[PDB]
């Protein structure tokens, strides 16, 4: 197994299970949010992260963290600070930061 595969799978599973994860489980639907991709140039979501993980795309923990940050940051970039989406992003990020920081090998990345 990849040196980070197990840690990444565990964190991703927890993210997907999280109360605040629902908006981020799949790519944003263009028919429901017609201008989304006009603004967000590096889209990301948890199903994409799962597919990347399974496709051996996360050799460096840094790449996984980058993708998690696209989910949170893209969300706060597109949505108003007073919206539920902004709140979910903040909550899921706080959770993510704690989950990674608590693994000593990756604490330097948070």
């Amino acid at each position: 197994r990849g040196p980070h595969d197990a840690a990444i799978q565990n964190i991703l599973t927890e993210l997907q299970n999280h109360a605040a994860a629902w908006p981020f489980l799949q790519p944003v639907n263009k028919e429901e949010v017609p201008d989304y991709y006009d603004f967000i140039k590096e889209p990301m979501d948890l199903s994409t992260m799962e597919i990347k993980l399974e496709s051996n795309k996360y050799q460096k923990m840094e790449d996984f963290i980058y993708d998690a940050r696209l989910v949170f940051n893209n969300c706060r970039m597109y949505n108003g600070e007073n919206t539920s989406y902004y709140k979910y992003a903040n909550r899921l990020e706080k959770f993510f930061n704690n989950k990674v920081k608590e693994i000593p090998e990756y604490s330097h990345l948070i």
Binding site: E32, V33, F39, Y78, N79, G80, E81, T83
Partner: peptide, 5 residues
Amino acid sequence: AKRHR
């Protein structure tokens, strides 16, 4: 609905 800020 989700919409640009």
